[model samples]
Target: AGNETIETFLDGLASSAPTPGGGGAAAISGAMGAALVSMVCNLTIGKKKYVEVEADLKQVLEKSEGLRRTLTGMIADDVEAFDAVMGAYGLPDEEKAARAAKIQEALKTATDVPLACCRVCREVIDLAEIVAEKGNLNVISDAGVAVLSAYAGLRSAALNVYVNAKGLDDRAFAEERLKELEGLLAEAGALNERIYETVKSKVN
Candidate 1:
């Protein structure tokens, strides 16, 4: 997947294959969001008119690029994690204890992948907010879509977390992750609305 094209990924997603499902899709969505933010920053930075915010836009550009890379890698990570889960399930059931343990461990890893993704996407929203408020006026609309895309990806990742968490045997781990996911969701809701309004006001 390192050199996979967008059309190839979309085709895989549309297939009956399950590895590159919602989890991978969430990461792709978040990567797009971060990329949009980067576009806004690039348009704003290095322009004589936006010289006052040059330093700030540069910082935003670096951070958004980092997130874009992270989320992009996560696209493959999600597939690998899902594959691990499937492999664990396919293990010999004759060894009930061993199979159960392996399944639980794989499920936890699967849950963790999406949980990490949720955090990354929240950061994406934060960056989107920054660009919405301070990015170039011409591309401010891109900033708006950034936040919406990131927010949607965040919520989509949360669902994967919830599903994997539900399958785990460890109540404590599951509960803790669920709590963290809830916190991220709550913050994202407020930020999404605030950024959306900020974008609207700027565009008008």
Candidate 2:
């Protein structure tokens, strides 16, 4: 996925290919959200109005860049995770006992990839708040876009988690993961609304 051009990726995503499915979309969305945060920070730095926060913006910029990289890597991880799950499912039933264990472990990995995406998306939203508040009033709408992008990633990744959780044999593990995901969804949802309000107030 990293090697494919955006157009090529779009083609694959549009096709019947199951490799780049919901998890891949979720990861890329989160990466885009972090990328937007980096953009606002870039615009804010070396500017007269936001000079006071230049130091902070630089920190946010670097942190967002790192998060973007993490999310980007997950794009490939999601593909690999899906393939692993499929491979596990295809294992010969002669090893019945181990086959169930293999599928369960694969599901756990599949669930993990998106959960990580959701976690990073929350951080992206946190960074967007700073930029929306103090980055650059000139491009405040971009800040709004950043928050919304992160929110989309958060909710999309949550859906992947829910879908994966249903087949998990380890009920305890699935419940714990769902609990944490819900907490992230709650926080990101409220923060996204606050960032949107802040950006709107400035835009008008």
Candidate 3:
């Protein structure tokens, strides 16, 4: 996906391809949310009225920008993990034990990718809260958008984690991942609503 146009990515997403499915979409959604967080911070950074929070804004700008890049990279990563799972499934059936082991390993990789995405998406939601509460007020609506997008991505990644968990031979690991995903979604869901309300209060 290097240098590929956004339209092209959307095209593939719309196509019959499996790589850019829910996982990739989740990452992109979070990436967009993180990007929005960065925008809010950047706008607040140089404002005369916001001079008191310049350091905080700059710090958030750094974190949001880094999360943006991480989320973007995860789009490709979802595809890679999916490929690994497929490759594992393609392993020769002659040694059933070996094949099963490979699949378990692949499933872990697949689950880990989405788990990581959900974690990062949750971070984006946290950043949105800060941006909405303290960043420039003029761009408050963008903070709402950021939280919403991150919520969508966080939920989307949870679905991937759920499905992958079903196939996992490691029940303990699956439970751990599920618990983590649930916590992120549960906590972030509340935060998203708060940020949305905060943004709306400003607009109203």
Candidate 4:
């Protein structure tokens, strides 16, 4: 999925294969959100009219670009993680203890991957906040879309986290991650709505 075109990836996603499921889709959404921030920053930076905020826009561009790269890489990471979980499930069932252990380990990895994705999606929101506040007014709506997209991705990633956590035998690990996810959602929920309202007011 890393090197595949959008059409190829979407086709795969649409197909019966389960590797690139909601997790990959969420990561893609996050990447696009960060990319939109970069777009707004690019439009704002180096413009004489926005010279006062050039430095800030440049910083936003750098961070947004980095998050985009991270989120893009997560697309493939999610596929690989899901495949690992599937492989663990496919393991011979005769050896109950060993198989159970392997599944638990694989499930943890699966849980962790999406948890990381949720974290990245949260950061995407942070960047969106910056872009919405300081980016080009001409593309302020893009900043709004960025916040919505990242919030969608964050919530989507949370679903994956919850599903995988349900299967985790290590209650400690599962609970910790879930707690972190809840915090992110709480914070992002408020901020995203604010950003959306800000954009709406600006557009109106």
Candidate 5:
């Protein structure tokens, strides 16, 4: 997958130097999934043969395009979040109070980055369901690609979330968020299965 490039960059982030981390990857995954959905919707929209679904398809077209743009923007956001976490860590240690406060701030920022990624990925999965249900049969397979990739991305992103969040002082908050994510993951998993089968049914 071309995503490997992103992964490679993240792997290089020193435990110390921090641009490119789990949050960024999660954002990328969410974006990739949305892009795939857009691909399917693009394939479906404005087809003469699809006149019956044209109005609805038009609506989907609008959403798919918007989501595509949003997701693409996230790639940079992931980078920014990673960079912010790094910058926070770089705060001067000349004063113990400043260093301590800065570390706590960095951890919070780090947590927020992946948290945002998780939220977006969850939405992307929801969009995947729409694409699978109504996008053109010709492109249903592509929708499957989006669904699976998004699911994998979400799972991977979750790990990123888990590891970074574990160090936070906010145990209750982290645990609650994790619970929410776990539920969403299960939903995405079941939905992916349904989408896969639906797409398969169109196979001749």
Candidate 6:
């Protein structure tokens, strides 16, 4: 993470009262997970004896790199979404009707960022599994690391989602979304363990 330029920028801007807030962190975390998955793939692809999987390795490598780039870009998206929430939060509260609308809109935007993070993190996990199964057995542990990181990202992003959703003025909508995310988090958690075990078993 220290080597990541975008992460470095976010660290510098963390206290600047700008964007690159929690959502950005979550997205980058997911991206980091994706990058790790790619790391495993890169280390294992096209070994001399594994020519049978050459085509699949080629495809996984391309996808892994693409996801890494995409998730990196989402780091910017997280910041942009945070900025929108901040702007909407700045709307004058003296105008009661308009103020209520603005607050709700802002809260929705705030919730959306982390929700997007959850979705992407889940995708990272999915890809991790794909590569974990396909990667050379020698490097399967690193693929496991990718799965674990994505798992962490999902939980971390879920917390962000919870905090922002709690602030939503629309109780019903917030409740529904919260339930949905909680369920997703639980399912993702289970799947993560399953993937880890599968990887471990393969390594053995």
Which regions of candidate 2 are displaced past 4 Å? none
Which lDDT values do the candidates have, in the order given?
Answer: 0.91, 0.89, 0.90, 0.90, 0.70, 0.76
Top model by lDDT, which number?
A: 1
Number of backbone-clashing residue pairs for each candidate, in the order shown: 0, 0, 0, 0, 0, 0
Q: How many clashing residue pairs are found in candidate 1?
A: 0
lDDT of 6 at 25: 67
Q: Which residue window of length 10 is worst by lDDT in model 1?
A: 1-10
- Estimate, for each residue in 52-96, the C-alpha lDDT of model 2 and write its tens digit: 999999999999999999999988998998899899989885599
TM-score of 1: 0.96
Model 4 clashes, total count: 0
Lowest summed lDDT over 10 consecutive residues: which window, candidate 2? 19-28
The local lDDT score (0 to 100) that residue 147 gets in candidate 4 is 96
Task: State the lDDT of candidate 3 residue by residue for 11-57, as single tens digits.
Answer: 99899887678898899899999999999998898889999989988
TM-score of each: 0.96, 0.96, 0.96, 0.96, 0.79, 0.80
> Candidate 4: lDDT of 44?
94
- Candidate closer to the true structure by lDDT (higher is better), 4 or 6: 4
Instruction: In model 6, state the lDDT of residue 109.
Output: 71
Q: Indicate whether candidate 2 or candidate 6 has the larger lDDT.
A: 2
Please provide, for model 5 over 1-77, each residue's C-alpha lDDT reduced to its tens digit, 9 standing for 90 to 100: 22457546556543554555555555666777878887887887777876776677677667756765666566666
CA shift of 154, model 1, Å = 0.3
RMSD of each: 1.3, 1.2, 1.2, 1.2, 3.9, 3.2
